[PDB]
Design a binder for this molecule. Structure first.
Ligand SMILES: *Cc1cc2c(cc1C)nc1c(=O)[nH]c(=O)nc-1n2C[C@H](O)[C@H](O)[C@H](O)COP(=O)(O)OP(=O)(O)OC[C@H]1O[C@@H](n2cnc3c(N)ncnc32)[C@H](O)[C@@H]1O
Ligand SMILES: O=C([O-])c1ccc[nH]1
Ligand SMILES: [Cl-]
Length: 385
């Protein structure tokens, strides 16, 4: 017997941010999650996340990146949890052979972002611990950094709840009933209604959007990360080793400086196992590629950070065909908002997206230009059942 103004299904990176934005405005919100956020079953754990402004995936993301950065600084001031460390982000690759590096440079120029350009030995000299061939070039963004993702979700949740938002945990939504003037969700712990619905189930969007009569190609990928004992005099955040995302012949890698001695963290971005979110093996090390693809990068580019494996994590990316997000109203229901297919690069925008989802649910519009994330774009290959 409890109607809500807005129901958020999936209270992770996007959902909890939306919950906070709504609660902050006095909107009676209910957030439902299959687990208890922040947790290690979705796409937001592993402690840290990179936030970049000059965007290699496309200069069109810059405005949202900058707005999210300001929102992260706001969050830092509101909670006792640590939110952001300004490590700076280094992007490098073989000269003339990296669309990622090239677009990062164009994005910086187009938006007048503050960056340093360097190449070859200048890279190795500036950051002892990095060994790149002389034909490599780079763009460093000093004001970009590292977000503590689990802390962000925890902070958004504590703040939203302090303002009246309710979070129903360990409750998996199994079906939806949408009408022109209301929405309803069904779970084993009961059913709930509201005027608006925000759907942000992460990897599970690939399995349950069909319950909303949507048919969108979405592929979940198993993506691991490892923490390695490193030479702290070189790879510690304390001596300014940066976060980084780089392109080499066999793909894109990313990493973080060692924070408080927990070790340099590394991940292989362009390769992962296609999986189903309910059958994925969440144990690091079960596939030999988990650790080997990482050491293959370290022994070659960051040899002093190739020590004992201290920790591993298994997480998921949910890719769309063009690797751009889906943030829009359900094409048949203006009272339903969809947030999906973040394709391995959405956390840094979660604060900004929470704001967009909020506007979409309350007004059916957003002040942000979100056309590139349209659910009706052709490259997406979307359709109704
Ligand atoms: C996995 C990964 C991702 C990643 C990254 C490194 C790894 C190993 N590094 C990143 C980085 O440095 N910078 C960045 O900007 N992004 C990075 N990413 C990607 C980012 O983490 C993902 O894009 C982001 O987390 C996506 O967020 P979203 O909110 O979509 O996903 P979630 O946080 O997993 O939340 C979904 C929640 O919904 C719940 N759920 C699922 N099904 C149900 C049902 N049926 N009912 C109720 N709740 C449901 C989940 O439990 C989850 O909490
Ligand atoms: O989007 C990013 O910055 C990122 C780093 C690792 C995966 N995604
Ligand atoms: Cl993702």
């Amino acid at each position: 017997s409890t109607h809500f103004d807005v129901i958020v299904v999936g209270a992770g990176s996007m959902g909890m941010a939306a919950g906070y934005q709504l609660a902050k405005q006095g909107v009676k919100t209910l957030l439902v999650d299959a687990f208890d956020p922040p947790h290690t079953n979705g796409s937001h754990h592993g402690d840290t996340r990179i936030i970049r402004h000059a965007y290699g995936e496309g200069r069109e993301y810059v405005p949202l990146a900058l707005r999210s950065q300001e929102l992260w600084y706001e969050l830092e001031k509101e909670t006792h949890h640590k939110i952001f460390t300004k490590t700076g982000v280094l992007v490098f690759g073989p000269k003339g052979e990296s669309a990622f590096v090239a677009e990062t440079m164009e994005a910086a120029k187009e938006h007048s972002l503050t960056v340093d350009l360097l190449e070859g030995d200048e890279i190795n000299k500036r950051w002892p611990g990095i060994t790149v061939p002389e034909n490599y070039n780079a763009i460093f963004e000093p004001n970009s950094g590292v977000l503590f993702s689990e802390n962000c979700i925890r902070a958004y949740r504590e703040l939203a709840e302090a303002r009246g938002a309710k979070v129903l945990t360990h409750t998996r939504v199994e079906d939806f009933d949408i009408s022109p003037d209301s929405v309803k969700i069904e779970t084993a712990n009961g059913s709930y209604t509201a005027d608006k619905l925000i759907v942000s189930m992460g990897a599970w969007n690939s399995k349950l959007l069909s319950k909303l009569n949507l048919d969108i190609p979405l592929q979940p990928y198993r993506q691991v990360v490892g923490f390695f004992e490193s030479d702290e005099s070189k790879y510690s955040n304390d001596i300014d080793f940066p976060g980084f995302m780089v392109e080499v012949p066999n793909g894109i890698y990313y990493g973080f400086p060692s924070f408080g001695g927990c070790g340099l963290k590394l991940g292989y971005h362009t390769f992962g196992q296609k999986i189903d979110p309910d059958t994925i093996n969440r144990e690091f090390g079960v596939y030999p590629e988990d650790e080997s693809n990482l050491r293959a990068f370290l022994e070659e580019y960051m040899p002093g950070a190739n020590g004992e494996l201290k920790r591993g994590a298994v997480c998921m990316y949910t890719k769309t065909l063009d690797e751009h997000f889906i943030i829009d109203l359900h094409p048949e229901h203006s009272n339903v908002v969809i947030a999906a297919g973040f394709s391995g690069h959405g956390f840094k925008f979660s604060s900004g997206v929470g704001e967009v989802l909020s506007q979409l649910a309350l007004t059916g519009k957003t002040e942000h230009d979100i056309s590139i994330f349209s659910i009706n774009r052709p490259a997406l290959k979307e359709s109704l059942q």
